[PDB]
Write a protein of this length. Structure first.
Lengths: 126, 48, 182, 48, 76
RNA sequence: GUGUAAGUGCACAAGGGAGCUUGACUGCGAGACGGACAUGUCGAGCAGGGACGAAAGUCGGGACUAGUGAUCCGGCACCUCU
């Protein structure tokens, strides 16, 4: 008989993030030659995918889970920068040149801005 | 009232743009920056 | 390397006391306070603005941080209130600031209340949040008696993590709240 | 923290009728605070 | 008192399902957003829906809104 | 609740708040709606020069539909016309 009175802060945060990601998906969509770079950020890791919405696939993906990018002793911003470089030349290997950056409903700053400029300086112009 | 007023350029002073405004909300002479065709750039347009 | 004594007390002995009283299945069902909100609704500020500035100074001196002016969100003719003019100030206290304000209030302000006979423990509402209101502002020594020119009470509310009135009242009593007995 | 929007903080020693020394931050510039009655000496808290 | 009325605005759907259209052709004339723009369909200043690319008009529903789309008919 | 009548819509907000700003632009405009004619309405996109944004991008007034008057005659400013 332990029923919390209201919504947990985790539920509020998840709902707000989903809602304001959907509100930005109104204008942002990915195509075959212009795919959408959607980034998901947690308190411990970051993940990025290259999504072609007209068919619903993922041409390339990168994250902090893999041990290669786990090995860098750098800070979370450094991990994001490495993830950005990894997604950048993985997309290079995928034949994709121009992308659109989907920030996934988070504020454009900190780690997200970090891997955004990391991908930008690696040759992926967007 | 919102009377029709004219905004002239600063350099060549041609009364190009016109619009209405409240003479009591902004009794002072309006200042706005607009595109001037013959000069080809963006300069402020002043009231007359 | 520095903690408010109220926070130390809650973290060390009050948490254990609540745990043994209610036998929570997991260590994060322990009810702890979240924030303390101070309201002073002027109401008469619809006539004169300087009352709002006075309330701003009162809240700034009492809480220690600049309050927020609450606008009138509905226009009512009987109170000759329209949209846009200020009505009341409000301060949200969290963390160390809330702990220190609670300690100061409990140990200083309440005994300074004239003929202070206690606070009724019936003011909780379902989720164990205590809302009580004062009448003046002289109980705090942060604000000087000669400085004031008109009494101004407030509405203190302490929203806690607790789910029931019993747990909230137990937590407040362990915190040192001077409740009556009924 | 907005720098110029809040009052000043200082080590304040709260003095009660019982003579207890209470070093804790507040906004009073006197440094040491003398208070006649508090929870330690109030009849309500002491059961009198 | 009565006797004042406004002229009819001739609103409604101009191109129905299956009709082929050219770029910029007006599809529906509406006051509200009764039909929402879909693929290759824009929205005007007065909520007028117009074709952005040639093809066949195709009426569909998306998330509970009725929408108008343009099917890119196959080149011969 | 949407400035304002009603209707059609808008909670994905077109509703509420904040930052900067003046596109409440210049030359145009494929294709259309409606219509006796004159009126009227929508418009992707191109160029110039800008605003906002990290970017994609949006902006040729306002959620839309009312707030207005043809022709003649005359005033003012500019023109490499006579």
């Amino acid at each position: 008989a332990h029923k919390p009175v209201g919504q947990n802060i985790s539920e509020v945060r998840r709902n707000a993030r989903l809602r304001r990601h959907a509100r930005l998906r109104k204008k942002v969509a990915g195509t075959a030659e212009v795919p959408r770079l959607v980034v998901n950020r947690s308190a411990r890791h970051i993940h990025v995918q290259l999504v072609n919405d007209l068919n619903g696939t993922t041409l390339a993906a990168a994250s902090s889970i893999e041990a290669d990018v786990r090995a860098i002793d750098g800070d979370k911003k450094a991990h994001s920068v490495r993830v950005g470089q990894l997604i950048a030349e993985r997309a290079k290997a995928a034949g994709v040149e121009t992308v659109v950056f989907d920030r996934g409903g988070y504020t454009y700053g900190g780690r997200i801005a970090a891997l955004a400029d990391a991908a930008r300086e690696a040759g992926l112009k967007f | 009232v919102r009377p029709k007023i004219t905004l002239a350029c600063e350099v060549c002073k041609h009364r190009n743009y016109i619009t209405k405004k409240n003479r009591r909300n902004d009794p002072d002479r309006l200042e706005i920056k607009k595109f001037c065709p013959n000069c080809g750039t963006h300069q402020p347009h002043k009231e007359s | 390397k520095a903690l408010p004594r109220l926070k130390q007390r809650y973290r060390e002995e009050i948490r254990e006391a609540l745990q043994q009283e209610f036998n929570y299945a997991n260590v994060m069902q322990i009810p702890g306070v979240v924030k303390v909100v101070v309201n002073m609704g002027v109401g008469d500020a619809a006539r004169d603005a300087k009352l709002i500035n006075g309330a701003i100074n009162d809240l700034a001196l009492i809480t220690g941080q600049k309050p927020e002016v609450r606008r009138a969100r509905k226009s009512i003719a009987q109170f000759k209130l329209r949209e846009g003019m200020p009505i009341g100030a409000r301060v949200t206290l969290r963390g160390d600031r809330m702990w220190e304000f609670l300690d100061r209030l409990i140990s200083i302000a309440l005994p300074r209340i004239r003929d202070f006979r206690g606070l009724s423990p019936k003011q909780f509402d379902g989720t164990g949040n205590y809302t009580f209101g004062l009448n003046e502002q002289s109980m705090f020594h942060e604000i000087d008696v000669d400085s004031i020119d008109r009494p101004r009470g407030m509405d203190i509310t302490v929203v806690t993590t607790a789910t029931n009135d019993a747990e909230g009242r137990a937590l407040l009593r362990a915190l040192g709240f001077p409740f009556k007995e009924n | 923290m907005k720098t110029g929007i809040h009052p000043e903080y200082v080590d304040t020693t709260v003095q009660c009728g019982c003579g207890h020394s209470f070093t804790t931050r507040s906004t009073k510039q006197s440094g040491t605070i003398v208070v006649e009655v508090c929870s330690q000496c109030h009849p309500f808290y002491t059961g009198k | 008192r009565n006797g004042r009325d406004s002229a009819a605005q001739r609103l409604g759907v101009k191109r129905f399902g299956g009709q082929v259209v050219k770029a910029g052709e007006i599809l529906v004339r509406q006051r509200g957003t009764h039909f929402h723009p879909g693929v290759n369909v824009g929205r005007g200043g007065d909520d007028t829906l117009f074709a952005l690319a040639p093809g066949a008009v195709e009426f569909g529903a998306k998330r509970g809104r009725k929408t108008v789309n343009i099917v890119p008919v196959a080149r011969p």
